[PDB]
Amino acid sequence: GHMDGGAGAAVSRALQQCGQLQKLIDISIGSLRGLRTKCSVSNDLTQQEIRTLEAKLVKYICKQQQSKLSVTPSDRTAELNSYPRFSDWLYIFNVRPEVVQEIPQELTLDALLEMDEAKAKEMLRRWGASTEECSRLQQALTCLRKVTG
């Protein structure tokens, strides 16, 4: 409710970065994409760069619920309403993609951000998140609803 209401010339700041640029999300995530599989790196400072890239990526994927203050959440686009993509979201903190593959296709982050934290904990725990694993996740999933907006 602060300049949002019409995603016209304001949508560009959420939409160019939705796909057109694809450097911010992909290139930053490529670094962790490598790290998720290849953890033998001789470059310590890059482990820290990657650490930044991960946290930074949340600002790119969840910007559409944060920067929705300029781009109406009721407008954005179907694509912008599909963000943050669970696949491109859980990969940032590792929310066990092993577990997310057990989730029914109708239920996605779309519905996860929609559910209660207590409820989500029990959902995740029913998909393979093994109790403490879920708690580790919950603390990171909460970042979504704490990304401002």
Side-chain angles (χ1 to χ4, degrees):
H2 184 83
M3 181 59 186
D4 61 286
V11 73
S12 186
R13 69 179 65 190
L15 205 170
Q16 282 298 271
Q17 297 66 212
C18 181
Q20 182 64 331
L21 299 183
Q22 217 38 265
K23 178 190 292 176
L24 293 64
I25 300 180
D26 191 71
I27 279 50
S28 306
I29 211 176
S31 312
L32 45 142
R33 182 182 294 143
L35 183 63
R36 302 292 84 120
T37 304
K38 311 293 285 74
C39 45
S40 304
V41 196
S42 305
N43 216 83
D44 302 75
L45 73 90
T46 300
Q47 295 295 269
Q48 278 52 270
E49 300 183 282
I50 297 163
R51 189 185 304 203
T52 301
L53 308 182
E54 299 177 285
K56 177 184 57 161
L57 249 145
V58 181
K59 290 69 169 54
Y60 299 142
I61 61 175
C62 306
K63 63 165 185 291
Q64 45 62 269
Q65 63 194 270
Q66 174 196 90
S67 296
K68 68 175 184 184
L69 276 298
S70 185
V71 181
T72 330
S74 314
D75 187 89
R76 40 190 177 194
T77 45
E79 180 177 71
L80 266 299
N81 286 275
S82 302
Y83 288 110
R85 258 297 174 242
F86 206 168
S87 46
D88 302 83
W89 179 87
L90 52 36
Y91 198 82
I92 311 299
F93 345 88
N94 172 264
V95 187
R96 295 295 187 164
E98 311 175 272
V99 171
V100 167
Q101 289 298 270
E102 301 298 288
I103 306 181
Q105 52 286 328
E106 303 71 33
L107 201 165
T108 334
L109 183 59
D110 308 49
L112 187 64
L113 65 77
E114 160 177 282
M115 58 180 62
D116 304 63
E117 52 182 287
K119 181 184 294 170
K121 164 282 296 295
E122 56 182 82
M123 293 303 295
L124 256 292
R125 193 281 179 171
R126 296 171 183 125
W127 286 315
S130 306
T131 307
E132 183 180 287
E133 289 302 290
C134 187
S135 307
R136 188 281 172 158
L137 307 181
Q138 297 289 328
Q139 296 172 89
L141 318 186
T142 300
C143 187
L144 182 63
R145 53 181 294 216
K146 287 283 68 172
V147 68
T148 308

